[PDB]
């Protein structure tokens, strides 16, 4: 167990007696043991501190601000992550500066101190986020193993996405979760149901998890129709999940997403699930989803009257999880060659192992296609195809003093159509890959791979000029419209957001924010309304589109598009020593950029900062 | 814990001074903002801070009549109505929510009236 999670029952004891007393403490403890420091966080069990009263969503979910929480997104695809607003709100609470969380938590930083986040129920839910604000806030920052994270939940409720979850897969962030689940916790399962569904019962059943609150009368009533529509819930989820990761269905699948409504929360992180007998640690969370489901069911149909009963008595049983923790038995279900025995212990039936196993498989074969990925972008007929183009057909466009972009786009030699017919094989592998992508069968960390991430940039930094006069070359930006806006292949966008996030992500920004830094750093004197309309999808933020500006600025008077040529002119240098455009190339005397900035006025040109890189018309 | 104060009633060309206080050390880690609902219509988007930062952007009927301010030493929001409008009449909410998308910790609103 512990050469698998990093965390061995000396730390789950600590955190587990600093949950304890969390409870008797304002918003959080902080527990010095030596070496390490312990932030447990206050559990709560209102109704409110699990669907706000002001959100008006359906699971009380809230997209997070891609400012403060940069990572927690896909990258190609942009969409950010989901949480649970109550959550945050909650972790938005304690990093209040006179909670001294904060400063704690900087005391700890300086001191190379292990920082371990914990709580009970949704208490661990609040821990998660913790790490997660820490793991945007510090870890990325500067990532030393003392900086390191470990967040420990007992309990805790779900908290976000399936973006969530995979974004904390690509920066390969989820190894520093355990959720410990006893098979039967209701809370875990909690926010997988409709908010409508439970509105009448979570009073009293929240009164009943509360261990401080032995008022409330037990009612049998009230606490089988919560678990009857949890699991009803959870059971429909499961279903539509089910359906889908097995990629049939889709029409009708697609059809009733449009007309269902399905909570959106999903396992995050390793879970480790516990029986009388039995630890199970799960890493795959649509396995984990699929087993929250097919574990909480009764054996017999004599039980069936039981089993919520145990549900709600089972959150309050960790104290002998903690104490039988070195008397169970451990097994990775991941790793196991049968998993049978396993599930059979954690009263799994056998379609419920059937889909965990159709789960893992599925997972399997996304590895598999990043190994062929890996094997296709690291043989030597794909290696020598970008060759050709770098070493064979830019040097002699260069020889020809007009470059490989306008050689490319009047193609009146044969090595223009060589180019082409790689740059459309070329486009097929990465359209392929990007498709692979976009329907999530390749592995979390694919966008995060640095060998990718290089191969793709290096891809878009030489073919996308290519793609862009193979566009203007056939006159699609008068049928269909502006490159930027209608015509940009998604692969190169893709390509540009893996490559601006691994650069950006250890400083905290967005590409966003630096573009318009700079612009407004540009000095124009513009209202920045007026600037960012001027400016609406400019081919200005990517440097392998300088072309496709080119293109959009020719033909214009200087007036309408003064503005664009001041910022295409600002973009330059970084562009050339960032590798994003050649600078032996955009200059040649038979260069359209070149051809088009001599017709410019010369009031410009002679305190334009390109006035000492060519010779002015004579 | 937030509260908002400074309606009242004027015609045009008014100057009023809308203040938005909270409880919870708000000012410059969560950015301000300031929405109006107008009777029936859409809580139409006024302005908002960007927080520490200060980017702010105003929306056309506004741009250079109503300011907006924030205060750390008093964790406040000022808004100034200079040159009123009748078509202003709403309710002015005071609205501060960082982490997220969409801003969320509103206020209980004060009613601003413009006649002729």
């Known amino acids: 167990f512990e050469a698998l999670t990093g965390i061995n029952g000396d730390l789950i004891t600590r955190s587990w007696s600093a949950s304890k007393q969390a409870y008797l403490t304002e918003r959080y403890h902080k527990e010095e043991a030596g070496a390490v420091v312990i932030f447990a966080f206050q559990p709560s069990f209102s109704e409110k501190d699990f669907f706000d009263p002001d959100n008006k969503s359906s699971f009380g979910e809230i997209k997070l601000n891609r400012v403060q929480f940069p990572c927690m997104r896909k990258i190609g695809k942009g969409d950010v992550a989901t949480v649970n607003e109550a959550f945050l709100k909650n972790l938005e609470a304690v990093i209040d500066p006179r909670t001294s969380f904060q400063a704690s938590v900087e005391m700890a930083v300086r001191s190379r101190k292990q920082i371990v986040f914990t709580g009970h129920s949704s208490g661990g839910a609040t821990a998660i986020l913790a790490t997660v604000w820490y793991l945007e806030k510090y870890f990325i920052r500067n990532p030393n193993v003392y900086l390191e994270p470990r967040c420990v939940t007992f309990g805790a409720p779900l908290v976000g996405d399936s973006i969530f979850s995979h974004a904390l897969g690509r920066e390969k962030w989820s190894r520093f979760f355990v959720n410990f689940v006893t098979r039967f916790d209701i809370v875990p399962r909690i926010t997988l149901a409709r908010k409508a569904s439970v509105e009448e019962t979570l009073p009293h059943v929240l009164a009943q998890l509360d261990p401080r609150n032995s008022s409330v009368q037990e009612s049998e009533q009230r606490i089988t129709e919560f678990y009857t529509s949890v699991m009803r819930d959870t059971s429909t989820v499961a279903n539509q999940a089910v359906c889908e990761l097995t990629g049939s269905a889709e029409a009708i699948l697609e059809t009733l997403s449009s007309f269902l409504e399905l909570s959106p929360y999903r396992p995050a992180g390793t879970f480790v699930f516990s029986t009388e007998k039995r630890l199970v640690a799960v890493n795959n969370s649509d396995a984990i989803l699929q087993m929250l489901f097919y574990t909480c069911q009764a054996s017999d149909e004599q039980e069936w009257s039981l089993i919520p009963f145990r549900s709600i008595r089972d959150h309050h049983s960790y104290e002998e999880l903690v104490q039988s923790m070195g008397m169970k038995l451990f097994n990775h279900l991941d790793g196991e060659n049968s998993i049978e025995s396993s599930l059979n212990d954690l009263g799994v039936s056998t379609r419920g192992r059937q889909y965990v196993q159709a789960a893992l498989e599925e997972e399997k074969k996304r590895v598999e296609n990043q190994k062929k990925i890996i094997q296709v972008i690291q043989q030597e007929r794909f290696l020598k195809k970008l060759a050709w183009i770098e070493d064979e057909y830019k040097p002699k466009c260069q020889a020809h003093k007009n470059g490989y972009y306008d050689s490319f786009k009047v193609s009146n030699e044969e090595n223009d159509f060589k180019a082409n017919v790689k740059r459309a094989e070329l486009a097929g592998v990465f359209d392929e890959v990007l498709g692979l992508l976009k329907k999530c069968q390749l592995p979390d960390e694919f966008e995060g791979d640095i060998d990718w991430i290089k191969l793709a940039t290096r891809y878009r930094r030489l073919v996308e000029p290519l793609d862009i006069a193979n566009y203007h070359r056939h006159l699609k930006n008068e049928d269909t419209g502006p490159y930027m806006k209608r015509g940009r292949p998604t692969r190169y966008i893709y390509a540009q957001r893996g490559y601006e996030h691994h650069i950006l992500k250890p400083n905290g920004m967005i590409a966003e924010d630096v573009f318009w830094n700079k612009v407004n750093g540009l000095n124009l004197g513009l209202q920045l309304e007026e600037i960012q309309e001027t400016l609406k999808n400019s081919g200005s933020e990517c440097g392998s589109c300088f072309w496709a500006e080119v293109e959009e600025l020719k033909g214009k008077p200087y007036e309408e598009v003064e503005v664009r040529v001041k910022t295409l002119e600002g973009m330059l240098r970084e562009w050339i020593t960032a590798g994003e455009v050649d600078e032996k190339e955009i200059f040649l005397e038979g260069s359209t950029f070149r051809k088009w900035w001599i017709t410019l006025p010369k009031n410009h040109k002679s305190h334009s900062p390109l006035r000492d890189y060519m010779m002015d018309e004579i | 814990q937030l509260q908002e104060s400074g309606g009242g009633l004027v015609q045009a060309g008014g100057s009023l001074r809308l203040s938005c206080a909270g409880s919870?050390?708000?000012?410059?880690?969560?950015?301000m903002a300031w929405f109006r609902q107008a009777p029936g219509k859409e809580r139409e988007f006024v302005s908002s801070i960007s927080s520490s930062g200060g980017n702010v952007v105003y929306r056309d009927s506004v741009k250079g009549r109503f300011t907006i301010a924030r205060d750390n030493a008093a964790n406040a929001v000022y808004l100034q109505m200079n040159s009123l409008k009748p078509e202003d009449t709403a309710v002015y909410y005071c609205?501060?929510?960082?982490?997220?998308?969409?801003?969320?910790?509103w206020g209980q609103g004060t009613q601003v009236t413009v006649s002729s």
């Open positions: 609205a501060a929510k960082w982490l997220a998308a969409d801003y969320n910790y």
């Open positions: 919870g050390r708000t000012f410059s880690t969560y950015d």
